[PDB]
């Protein structure tokens, strides 16, 4: 399995990705990924149990969540893999990502409704069912609520942080994980959710297919961080209340640990990834 930069996909790879995503939607499977993410993001708190976000396991949790989704896509079309969106490079609404043959563009300014591409409500193919905002159409406002996506120099500042995570292992932490997540510092992952707007800014953010491409690039940055810091690894490593330690299992799967997910190459490679 090779995960490729979205900008490099062929016309046929875009068509097959789109068709596999729409089939998961039609069959009902897609919405249950939306529901899982919302349930975790509403339950993951800074002074109590936290697994999918605001915690060291943010990275392996989303790695496994993305693997579940990629394996579901591969059950429809075994040639499909998750592409990634390098938002430091493809940073405007003119990025081919947002073209009508891939994800479609920004929402109209009246109601945020996406009007083109395969996920526009008018196609009949993309009902928003798992929702909290009552509207049932995909929405986006690219660059609406925050002016700029992160730049490469900002990403580099975060990649340079050697410690994976630090006590208190939550949204207040110093260290790589929380700077990549974005609750502290110049803000990488959270800011991209805010920049897309629409459902991507909410607990039901997997309603937008760009969710997967965003998190596939966050996942690639973890892999790059590892190559930069071979002497660093996941922490904590045992006995931490409310936090998933290295060798503890993670909900909802219960059968996988962060330790099982540190090495992506057991599951996929990237089109290109720096050697240390």
């Amino acid at each position: 399995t090779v995960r490729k930069n979205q900008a490099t996909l062929t016309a046929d790879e875009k068509r097959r990705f789109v068709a596999a995503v729409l089939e998961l939607k039609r069959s009902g499977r897609y919405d249950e990924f939306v529901r899982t993410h919302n349930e975790f993001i509403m339950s993951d708190t800074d002074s109590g149990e936290r697994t999918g976000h605001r915690s060291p396991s943010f990275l392996p949790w989303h790695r496994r969540f993305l693997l579940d989704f990629e394996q579901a896509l591969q059950s429809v079309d075994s040639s499909v893999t998750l592409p990634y969106w390098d938002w430091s490079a493809d940073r405007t609404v003119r990025a081919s990502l947002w073209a009508p043959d891939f994800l479609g563009g920004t929402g109209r300014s009246t109601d945020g409704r996406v009007m083109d591409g395969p996920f526009a409500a008018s196609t009949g193919n993309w009902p928003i069912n798992v929702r909290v905002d009552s509207r049932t159409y995909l929405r986006r406002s690219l660059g609406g609520s925050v002016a700029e996506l992160p730049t490469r120099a900002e990403v580099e500042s975060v990649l340079a942080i050697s410690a994976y995570d630090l006590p208190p292992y939550n949204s207040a932490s110093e260290g790589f994980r929380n700077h990549l997540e974005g609750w502290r510092g110049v803000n990488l992952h959270n800011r991209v959710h805010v920049w897309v707007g629409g459902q991507m800014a909410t607990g039901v953010s997997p309603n937008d297919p760009v969710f997967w491409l965003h998190h596939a690039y966050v996942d690639k940055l973890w892999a790059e961080w590892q190559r930069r810091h071979p002497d660093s690894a996941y922490v904590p490593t045992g006995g931490t209340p409310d936090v998933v330690d290295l060798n503890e299992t993670m909900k909802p799967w219960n059968t996988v640990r962060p330790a099982d997910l540190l090495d992506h190459t057991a599951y996929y490679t990237f089109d290109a990834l720096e050697h240390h």
Partner: protein, 74 residues
């Protein structure tokens, strides 16, 4: 570590209310999930990656997000 004060106002035509419970927010009487971060900022489920300083700021951000739409109970 005690909770913020309660509030009640009409913001862009919609009633927003907040009260300690550990804090509840309502938009036109429909409860809105909100959460406090360790540093004292807040988010809601419709702005869950975007910290704002207070629960009223999170309620106002939700009204902004909704563009008139009824909230669904969560």
């Amino acid at each position: 570590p005690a909770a913020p004060e309660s509030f009640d106002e009409v913001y862009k035509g919609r009633r927003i209310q907040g009260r300690p419970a550990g804090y509840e927010v309502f938009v036109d009487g429909v409860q809105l999930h909100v959460m406090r971060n360790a540093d004292g900022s807040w988010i809601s489920v419709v702005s869950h990656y975007d910290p704002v300083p207070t629960p009223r700021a999170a309620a106002r951000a939700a009204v902004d997000e909704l563009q008139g739409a009824p909230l669904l109970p969560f």
